[PDB]
Amino acid sequence: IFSSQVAIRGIPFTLSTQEDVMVPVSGNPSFFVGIDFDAQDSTIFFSDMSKHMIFKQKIDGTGREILAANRVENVESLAFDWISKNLYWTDSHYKSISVMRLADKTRRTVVQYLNNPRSVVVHPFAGYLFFTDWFRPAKIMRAWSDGSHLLPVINTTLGWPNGLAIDWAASRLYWVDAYFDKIEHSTFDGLDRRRLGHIEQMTHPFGLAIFGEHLFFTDWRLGAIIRVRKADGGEMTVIRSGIAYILHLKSYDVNIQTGSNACNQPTHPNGDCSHFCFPVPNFQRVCGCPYGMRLASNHLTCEGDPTNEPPTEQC
Amino acid sequence: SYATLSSGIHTPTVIASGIGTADGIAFDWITRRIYYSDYLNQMINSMAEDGSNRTVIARVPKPRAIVLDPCQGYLYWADWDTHAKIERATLGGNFRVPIVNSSLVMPSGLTLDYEEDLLYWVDASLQRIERSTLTGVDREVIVNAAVHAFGLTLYGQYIYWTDLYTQRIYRANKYDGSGQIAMTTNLLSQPRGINTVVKNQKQQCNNPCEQFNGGCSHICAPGPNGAECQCPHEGNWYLANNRKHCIVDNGERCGASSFTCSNGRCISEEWKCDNDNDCGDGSDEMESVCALHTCSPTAFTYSYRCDYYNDCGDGSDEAGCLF
Ligand SMILES: *[C@@H]1O[C@H](CO)[C@@H](O)[C@H](O)[C@H]1NC(C)=O
Numbered sequence: 001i002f003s004s005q006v007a008i009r010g011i012p013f014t015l016s017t018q019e020d021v022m023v024p025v026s027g028n029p030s031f032f033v034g035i036d037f038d039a040q041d042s043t044i045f046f047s048d049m050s051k052h053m054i055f056k057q058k059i060d061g062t063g064r065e066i067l068a069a070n071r072v073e074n075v076e077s078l079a080f081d082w083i084s085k086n087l088y089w090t091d092s093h094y095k096s097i098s099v100m101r102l103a104d105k106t107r108r109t110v111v112q113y114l115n116n117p118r119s120v121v122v123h124p125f126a127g128y129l130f131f132t133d134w135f136r137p138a139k140i141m142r143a144w145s146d147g148s149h150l151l152p153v154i155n156t157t158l159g160w161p162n163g164l165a166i167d168w169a170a171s172r173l174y175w176v177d178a179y180f181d182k183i184e185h186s187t188f189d190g191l192d193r194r195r196l197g198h199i200e201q202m203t204h205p206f207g208l209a210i211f212g213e214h215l216f217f218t219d220w221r222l223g224a225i226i227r228v229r230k231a232d233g234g235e236m237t238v239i240r241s242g243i244a245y246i247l248h249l250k251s252y253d254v255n256i257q258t259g260s261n262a263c264n265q266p267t268h269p270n271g272d273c274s275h276f277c278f279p280v281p282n283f284q285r286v287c288g289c290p291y292g293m294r295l296a297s298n299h300l301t302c303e304g305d306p307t308n309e310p311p312t313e314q315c
Numbered sequence: 316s317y318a319t320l321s322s323g324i325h326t327p328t329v330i331a332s333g334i335g336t337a338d339g340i341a342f343d344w345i346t347r348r349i350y351y352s353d354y355l356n357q358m359i360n361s362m363a364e365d366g367s368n369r370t371v372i373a374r375v376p377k378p379r380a381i382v383l384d385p386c387q388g389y390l391y392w393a394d395w396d397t398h399a400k401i402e403r404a405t406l407g408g409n410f411r412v413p414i415v416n417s418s419l420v421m422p423s424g425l426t427l428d429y430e431e432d433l434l435y436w437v438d439a440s441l442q443r444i445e446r447s448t449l450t451g452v453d454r455e456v457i458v459n460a461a462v463h464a465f466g467l468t469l470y471g472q473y474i475y476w477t478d479l480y481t482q483r484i485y486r487a488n489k490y491d492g493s494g495q496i497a498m499t500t501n502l503l504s505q506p507r508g509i510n511t512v513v514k515n516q517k518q519q520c521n522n523p524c525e526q527f528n529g530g531c532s533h534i535c536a537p538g539p540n541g542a543e544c545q546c547p548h549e550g551n552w553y554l555a556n557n558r559k560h561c562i563v564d565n566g567e568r569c570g571a572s573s574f575t576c577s578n579g580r581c582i583s584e585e586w587k588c589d590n591d592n593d594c595g596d597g598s599d600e601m602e603s604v605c606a607l608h609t610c611s612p613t614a615f616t617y618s619y620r621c622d623y624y625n626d627c628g629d630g631s632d633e634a635g636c637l638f
């Protein structure tokens with residue numbers, strides 16, 4: 001799946017066939033930015049900066065449902081935890097990361113008071129949320145699913161980090177820097193920082209995607225979906241060319257969205273948390289509540305806190 | 316010793332008779348503990364209401380006068396050693412800081428203006444009564460002329476003291492000392508110490524030591540900002556947890572989430588309060604240790620939750636609704 005100003009389309013990974021497997025999502029006007037998928041529901045999530053709203057749509061285009069309207073100006077990424085059915089987005093205008101419980105559209109602002117977040121990604125099994133702040137001094141930061149422990153795992157030699165991709169097979173975070181034109185990968189703790197071989201003509205890469213042994217990425221100046229080997233690189237192959245304002249390259253796979261977690265327990269849905277499971281490392285859960293509510297004495301349930309959390313007026 | 320007032324012919328109750336020369340007593344109602352000073356052994360000790368729990372709070376070369384501020388949990392005292400100091404600390408003796416050390420020869424009759432938070436004392440050699448702030452920044456001589464003023468007490472707007480020379484009790488205004496009159500005639504002997512019997516409400520302050528000895532396996536002293544645990548002076552002890560439980564003090568106490576029990580053996584803090592005896596001592600799951608349910612968000616009250624396992628919280632122990 002690649003998102004561009006004109007539309008959002010899904011191309012097959014095979015080079016032989018070049019036919020959209022999903023109904024292209026287009027509108028007039030449109031500035032699509034940020035994409036995510038849901039394999040179980042065969043549904044994608046996308047943000048349209050032109051409409052200032054986040055929508056959901058099945059791959060066959062059957063239903064287009066609005067996900068969030070209020071307090072949304074510039075959503076630049078979408079992270080969806082398939083286990084807990086929670087969608088994470090970064091609103092640059094509010095400089096904050098918010099999570100919505102898709103089961104009831106319950107909304108909550110987690111990581112906040114940032115500078116210029118650009119991307120986000122949530123790892124359910126590891127219970128970690130990775131996001132990128134390209135504001136100089138640029139930094140790649142990690143936090144728990146609920147945003148508890150914000151930790152700058154990588155804060156050295158970062159000019160313009162744009163996209164983050166999680167290699168679920170090897171458990172390494174691959175990111176892209178547009179300032180130094182480099183594709184680098186480190187551990188979830190940011191320990192093993194290895195840079196790939198120099199990409200031939202990469203000037204302003206923005207997107208990234210890890211599939212098989214290939215590492216697709218998008219470059220604005222080239223306007224193409226260039227494929228390189230995830231090992232060291234090389235084998236530069238232009239999957240598509242001529243795309244105007246190419247952007248994110250969120251991938252799609254059924255195998256990615258599978259497995260158990262802190263949530264997904266038969267009689268502890270979301271770990272018996274009222275709204276938010278928020279899986280956290282070491283196979284544990286932290287219950288969460290919407291903006292209006294708070295954790296009760298027993299952390300499992302959620303209770304309203306009007307004294308500390310007055311209702312949010314629409315406008 | 317003490318004598319009960321409404322007990323007819325009361326015989327002095329012999330307690331802590333082993334001390335040698337000593338002229339200092341103060342009883343803290345808040346904790347029902349005596350603060351007898353052992354000047355001969357050069358140590359200020361604390362004792363139980365009956366004198367069972369003996370603990371040496373601090374050691375002073377020449378301790379004579381003792382003042383208690385239970386609400387503030389600070390122990391005020393004076394040292395008769397060279398360069399006499401008004402040494403102040405907590406009820407547990409955390410910060411032994413001399414409040415006033417200059418212009419003091421033989422301090423005596425320490426008194427505390429509870430209503431105004433001031434320190435009053437007399438000096439027989441100096442023959443003057445001075446007041447000071449609890450910290451000691453200010454210092455005003457309330458009474459300039461006196462003859463061997465030894466005792467002292469304060470109540471209302473008046474300050475009362477005793478003279479060894481004239482053998483009588485005087486009174487003066489606590490603010491300035493204008494009304495220096497004589498409260499009694501020439502007593503036959505020398506009045507040593509004068510105190511006020513506050514039959515009315517005294518300095519009441521909720522005692523942190525009330526709740527399970529204030530989270531202390533041993534003696535508890537209600538100092539400032541929460542209770543301050545105390546340990547017997549006879550044995551060598553080291554406070555465990557956040558300075559809470561006295562241990563053998565031999566060392567090798569595990570830190571972090573491996574808190575050491577009262578025996579000295581340490582077990583993981585997660586292992587603590589597991590409804591078992593991790594240490595040779597129940598301290599791992601001791602009552603005080605497991606006083607309240609403040610379970611972490613991580614743990615249900617979901618690793619073994621509702622999974623036919625009795626290793627999780629008791630609510631979800633084998634209570635598997637999915638089965
Ligand atoms: C980067 O993050 C680590 C972990 O928080 C921290 O120890 C280090 O001081 C940070 N350095 C910079 C460049 O801010």
Ligand SMILES: *[C@@H]1O[C@H](CO)[C@@H](O)[C@H](O)[C@H]1NC(C)=O
Binds near residue numbers: 363367368532533534
């Ligand atoms: C103090 O002495 C009494 C009487 O022997 C005893 O019951 C008590 O446990 C001792 N310690 C404390 C902490 O009160």
